[PDB]
Symmetry: C3
Subunit: 396 residues, 3 copies
Amino acid sequence: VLQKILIGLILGAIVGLILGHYGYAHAVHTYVKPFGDLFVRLLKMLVMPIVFASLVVGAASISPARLGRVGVKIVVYYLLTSAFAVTLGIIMARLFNPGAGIHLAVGPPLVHILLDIVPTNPFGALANGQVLPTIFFAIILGIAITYLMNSENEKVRKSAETLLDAINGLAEAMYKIVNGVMQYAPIGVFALIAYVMAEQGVHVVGELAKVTAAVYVGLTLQILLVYFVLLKIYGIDPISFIKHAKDAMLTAFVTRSSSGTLPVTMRVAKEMGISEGIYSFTLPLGATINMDGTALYQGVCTFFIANALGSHLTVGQQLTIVLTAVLASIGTAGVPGAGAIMLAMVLHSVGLPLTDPNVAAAYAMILGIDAILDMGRTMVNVTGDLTGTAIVAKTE
Amino acid sequence: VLQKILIGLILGAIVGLILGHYGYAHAVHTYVKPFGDLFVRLLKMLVMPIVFASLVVGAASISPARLGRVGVKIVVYYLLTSAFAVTLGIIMARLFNPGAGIHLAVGGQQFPPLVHILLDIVPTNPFGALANGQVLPTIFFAIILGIAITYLMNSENEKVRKSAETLLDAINGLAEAMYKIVNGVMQYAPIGVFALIAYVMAEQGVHVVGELAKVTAAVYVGLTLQILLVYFVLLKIYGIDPISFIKHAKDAMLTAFVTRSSSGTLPVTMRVAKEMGISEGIYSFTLPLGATINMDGTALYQGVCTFFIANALGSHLTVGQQLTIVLTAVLASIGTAGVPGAGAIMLAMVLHSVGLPLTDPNVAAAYAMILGIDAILDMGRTMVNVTGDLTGTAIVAKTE
Amino acid sequence: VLQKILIGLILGAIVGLILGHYGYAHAVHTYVKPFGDLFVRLLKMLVMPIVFASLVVGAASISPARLGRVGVKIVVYYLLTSAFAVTLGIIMARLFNPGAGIHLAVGGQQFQPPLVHILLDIVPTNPFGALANGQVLPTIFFAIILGIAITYLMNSENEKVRKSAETLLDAINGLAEAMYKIVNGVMQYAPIGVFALIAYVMAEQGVHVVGELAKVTAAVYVGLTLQILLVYFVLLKIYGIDPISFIKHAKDAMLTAFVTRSSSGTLPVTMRVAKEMGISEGIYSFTLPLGATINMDGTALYQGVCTFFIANALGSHLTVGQQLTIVLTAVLASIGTAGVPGAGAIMLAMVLHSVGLPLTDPNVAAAYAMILGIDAILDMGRTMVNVTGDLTGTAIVAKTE
Ligand SMILES: N[C@@H](CC(=O)O)C(=O)O
Ligand SMILES: N[C@@H](CC(=O)O)C(=O)O
Ligand SMILES: N[C@@H](CC(=O)O)C(=O)O
Ligand code: NA
Ligand code: NA
Ligand code: NA
Ligand code: NA
Ligand code: NA
Ligand code: NA
């Protein structure tokens, strides 16, 4: 069964939590966290081909619409889900008030980012991660192929259908393998939370426990208040959605890599019957743009620091968190650290840099339990993609 | 229309030239030169696949000849076109005499095994070579693959011949698809172009005065006379209509001028070779090769710079052994890469050949004057570097 | 003919040996060793595709067995071949006793991996990366996984799935095939390539094989010869395969491996000898690349006979007892040692700190620098046996399945 995951997740959360309370953070890290990393190694392996392949073959569907409309749909969808997510985490940090005790001890060109979506060598872009420029190209290829196939010349249309196939052969094959790599997941998962529990979990106490609640409640309320709602309204069964997306949420949670989860996310989109036309473009894009769980986490962390330091958090202009949280979320990468790291950009937005070494002394507190906040946050980052995809998949 | 390029090129050259006279070199650079770079990003994207694919499928044609003869032809073609080009630039710099005023201010200054270059043509990992630019080793391998494919298809075993034809197809699928795209990316060209000369005009253009204007003339007149005196002529004699050639190569010459990347123009140069009906067997090998070997417009620029410096410093430019420019210019040209600066950079090698290095900090004070308007000289020089590939390809395409 | 190789190897060994006795180590290196390197460049070129392709198509054959059994077989084969090889080189260095004269001159001086963070590295994180940056091993791991997913994709109820899948599998074979076509052409260069390659090593390190260095060399090559006759010829004979047909077939791989000293660079030529002696891509296209970095038999001997050379010149008792700890670590070091044309030297260090005599104690570091003075001589021999052991094992296991 795939409750062997929950058997691993629960057993591991427990076995983990215990062993780290007894100073064996290092019996774990040296002994258990390779099996958790192995699992990840595998899932990374599949991300590059599965993404490329499935997007070329996902330029099956209509050039100007689908893509055009679907992009714009999903983009618009993504923005509002994220712009909401922070506001929800603002409200969570006005509710829980994480910062009384005084912070104890002390001690990119934007444009030259947009241009970087258009690769300069697509084999480069392939061989060095780089989902986003890959996406951009994989699309352009898959479209040129469509047009090649409706050529009058039938040597053109011969080879073109040829190519398009092998590419699908691959995309398909990746999907075949994401099934096998899921067998490891119970062990993979067990080992992964075993670590984070026996490590940062035995540190979630006092005001750190306070902030953690303010996050995860916010994350829960993102789902029920936004996803379940937006699903319900759009006529899709929320509860069927969860049942199907169980596998991606668990990987995303446990891995904390949105980008690492992508194959498993994409195979959940396949096996809930959406078109490669949609999912194979919305998913990778969203996998780095729709960080809903980050925008909450960042909105609730800006507050945590500005409370321990005791600014008024502008009773007025804290929309400039909301704004910058969005912006930072969009920027934050899909690796299992960067929301912390990027939180900085929404901090210098509220005017409290990691230079004023009390700020830097709270932020370092936060960072002490990031991988805890990460799991939750990540899982919601991914879910937001599936929701959005699914919603837009039903609109088209 | 593709006169929207000329509408962009002329509007941009003007809008540019003006704004840079009014100290807005930075309103441009921050606001207009991304659109120009976007265009380039795109064209870079295509170069790697288009080059690889088209050459494997361009090992359609006859193994020993075609390739063999065509290589040798185009190589021989390339050498003499370049060896001429410098001599034409020598004559331009004896004509215009760019160096009376003494290289005034001093102080603002500047800092390969040959064999371990030839060996570097044979790649050690063809996916490496692919994923890291590297046209030349790619070419080498793409050929070798394209040939092994031909031979695989005439195998007695028909599972061998099944899969082989299969592979060769998808590869063509791609090569084809790239060509489809170089058509789309051409749509951007008018904006792309407008922005790209908007920059160079509003930047180094408002600096082309006095003896800098003098050297520019002696280059561009030399570049014009490379066309009329060598291309138009070598085209006419070989029976191809010059004026149909220019009409067809209007797109590659405009990209190359505006981009200044020989190598970045390659897809558009290769889709001009296709749509003037030459064989992938020829063009998909002569074009990439020449795109980094047949720098004619460089060898002129370098011959006419060596003279500009040795005039401002006032050496006799050896009344006798300035053939050692001619020789080294060739050698430098061959070497100079297809990126949008290196003719300047490489000019150094022909300077230390005439015996005046960038150490003697008056030399390095002229050479830094030159470098002040290089992108002006680059547009010109680059366009001629590409044209010379088309000319030679076309000429040799007609001989075979 | 392919005796134009032997005509080049012999002419070159001679022309080389002579010119380096007359201080023209640099007339050679500047003039002859490019043609030797060109040859290598080419063979490198083919390695990546040939390996990848042939393994995906090599996941023709049965998923659970073949692979399963063949792996375990070849793995088990490999261990014992190597574990023997050192013991043979132990015995060679008890026989020839290379270390009387005290390590003269001190002051040559060199400096001094997480295992688990090696195993994890076999599973690539981006297969295009792995491909584009050498990295045979993770490539293997993935190429298999691909080739198997392909097999299963082809027996799908959906026949659009089974359409494109067979499509893909074909082009991949188109390539594999095409590489093999080319390893034939690149063999044409071999006589020149070979001539130039030994021309170098002879006119360079060969005019240095004198005295105790000649002593150790003998103790190596005799050990290497006796690895063949005593182990290969034997294990071949017993398994019913004709040794002398095997040698006839593997003549081309052995000569490249010897002359190139790159086990990994020889791989196309080795893999095309496996093809043209009629083994399945199912076997050879997995056992050959794996072994090309794991089955270093000629290394484990060289390393066992080098530990002894140094421990003799320094005069330790070489533990009359626990020198099995060489045997053990030599295996481990052999397994680790890469297929590039130096690393047995470099890795010998790990079996030295195992016997407790590091390159810090600068007389150790003054012997090890003597060894290294003639490594490329020991390398040719050692390497060729590293490859042979792959063919032997492949062939043996190829006949078992
Ligand atoms: N690990 C997170 C990123 C973050 O920490 O912000 C994710 O992939 O969603
Ligand atoms: N940018 C030129 C090189 C040069 O300026 O010499 C070209 O690529 O053609
Ligand atoms: N050159 C050897 C490695 C070594 O010298 O240990 C080989 O490839 O087999
Ligand atoms: Na996401
Ligand atoms: Na993000
Ligand atoms: Na050129
Ligand atoms: Na050049
Ligand atoms: Na080996
Ligand atoms: Na090894």
